[PDB]
Write a protein that binds this ligand. Structure first.
Ligand SMILES: Cn1cc(-c2ccc(F)c(CNC(=O)c3cc(Br)ccc3O)c2)cn1
Ligand SMILES: [Zn+2]
Length: 343
C-alpha cells in the first residue's frame, strides 16, 4: 500500500506537467467540427463536453487522446435486436435520410461519410501533418508523429433511457434515489458495432459519478474525508493496461477493455456505499477487494453490465473461459507479488 501510492504519485507527475498535445488536438478537432457542421447530415455534430478536448482512455500513454462527437436524433424509434438487451436497431418517425436502408439506420453508410469528410479536411492543414489510419473508435488520426486522436460519433436522444436500463444503475444506497433520477434525465448515446446495430454509451454518466462520488456531499473536499474511490479505479485500469501491453503480442487479453474494469468497480461502490469503507488510509485493502471482486467475476463468468443488468459482459459466449482463466492467472500472480507490472 506504500507501493501503490508510489504508483499513483508517478501517474500524476505525468498527467500534470506541460505538453503541447492539447493545442495540436484542439486545433484539429475544431477544424473538423466546422467542416462537419458544413454538411447537412452532420449539421448538429458537436463535442460531448466543450472544454474537454482531453479525455485519455489510456492512463499510461498520455499521447493517445479520445474524443466523441454527438449528433442529436429527434424522434428516435429504438428496437432491441435478438433479445440481447444491449444492442438495438435505430429507426425514425430527416437529415440522416441518405443513410437509411428501409426503416433502419445504417452505421456503415454513416461512418463512411463521417470518414470521407474527415479524410478531406485533414489536408487543409499545412500547419500540422495529420494522417488517418484504416480501422479493424470510428476514426483515428495521427497528428505530427507522437499524438493520436480516436474520434467516435454517437447518436444522442433526449428522450428517456431505453426500457432495458430500468432496474439498472442501482446507486440508490450510495449516491441516492434523487440523484439516480437526475442522471436518468440526462440524454443517452448510441454508438455502433455488432447487422447495423447500436449500443448505449454511458461515459457521460460515469464521468459525473466520478466527480461526485461519495455518500457525503463533501467527500474529498477536505482532509478529514479524503477517500480512495478514484485511486482504486486508476489502479484497476493501470493493472489491465499494463497487462494488455505485456501480452499485446499474444491474443489472450484482446477481449478486455477499460470498461470491464469500470463496470466491476462501480459494483463494489454499490456493495460498499459508505465513505467510511474507502478511507484514504485503507487504500491497500480497498484495492485488494476490488482485485478480488474482478477475479470473482472472471471465475464465475458473471459480471452484470452496470446499466443493463440482464446483460453479462463475461458470459461464456462473449468471452471464452480460456482467456478469462488467463486474465485470472496474471492478476492473481501480480497480487501475490505486490504488482511488479506497475514498473
Ligand atoms: C467499450 N465498450 C463498451 C461496450 C458496451 C456494450 C454493451 C453495452 F450495453 C454498453 C453500455 N455501456 C456501459 O455499460 C458503460 C459503462 C460504463 Br462504467 C461507462 C461507459 C459505458 O458506456 C457498453 C462494449 N465495448
Ligand atoms: Zn471521495
Amino acid at each position: 500500500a506504500s507501493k501503490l501510492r508510489a504508483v499513483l504519485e508517478k501517474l500524476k507527475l505525468s498527467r500534470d506537467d506541460i505538453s503541447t498535445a492539447a493545442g495540436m488536438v484542439k486545433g484539429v478537432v475544431d477544424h473538423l467540427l466546422l467542416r462537419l457542421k458544413c454538411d447537412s447530415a452532420f449539421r448538429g455534430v458537436g463535442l460531448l463536453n466543450t472544454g474537454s478536448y482531453y479525455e485519455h482512455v489510456k492512463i499510461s500513454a498520455p499521447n493517445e487522446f479520445d474524443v466523441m462527437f454527438k449528433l442529436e436524433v429527434p424522434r428516435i424509434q429504438l428496437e432491441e435486436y435478438s433479445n440481447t438487451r444491449a444492442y438495438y436497431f435505430v429507426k425514425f418517425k430527416n437529415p440522416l435520410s441518405q443513410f437509411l436502408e428501409g426503416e433502419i439506420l445504417s452505421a456503415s453508410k454513416m461512418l463512411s461519410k463521417f470518414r470521407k469528410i474527415i479524410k478531406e479536411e485533414i489536408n487543409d492543414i499545412k500547419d500540422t501533418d495529420v494522417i488517418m489510419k484504416r480501422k479493424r473508435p470510428a476514426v483515428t488520426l495521427l497528428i505530427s508523429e507522437k499524438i493520436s486522436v480516436d474520434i467516435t460519433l454517437a447518436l444522442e436522444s433526449k428522450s428517456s433511457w431505453p426500457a432495458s436500463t430500468q432496474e439498472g444503475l442501482r446507486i440508490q444506497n450510495w449516491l441516492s434515489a434523487k440523484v439516480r433520477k437526475q442522471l436518468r434525465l440526462k440524454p443517452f448515446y448510441l454508438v455502433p458495432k455488432h447487422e447495423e446495430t447500436w449500443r448505449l454509451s454511458f461515459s457521460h454518466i460515469e464521468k459525473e459519478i466520478l466527480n461526485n462520488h461519495g455518500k457525503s456531499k463533501t467527500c474529498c473536499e477536505n482532509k478529514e474525508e479524503k477517500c480512495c474511490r478514484k485511486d482504486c479505479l486508476k489502479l484497476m485500469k493501470y493493472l489491465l493496461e499494463q497487462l494488455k501491453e505485456r501480452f499485446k503480442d499474444k491474443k489472450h487479453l484482446d477481449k478486455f477493455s477499460s470498461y470491464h474494469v469500470k463496470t466491476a468497480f462501480f459494483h463494489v461502490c454499490t456493495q460498499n456505499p459508505q465513505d467510511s469503507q474507502w478511507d484514504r488510509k485503507d487504500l491497500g485493502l480497498c484495492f485488494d477487494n476490488c482485485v478480488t471482486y474482478f477475479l470473482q467475476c472472471l471465475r464465475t463468468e458473471k459480471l452484470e453490465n452496470y446499466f443493463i443488468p440482464e446483460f453479462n459482459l463475461f458470459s461464456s459466449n462473449l468471452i471464452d473461459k480460456r482467456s478469462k482463466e488467463f486474465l485470472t492467472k496474471q492478476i492473481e500472480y501480480e497480487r501475490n507479488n505486490e504488482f511488479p507490472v506497475f514498473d
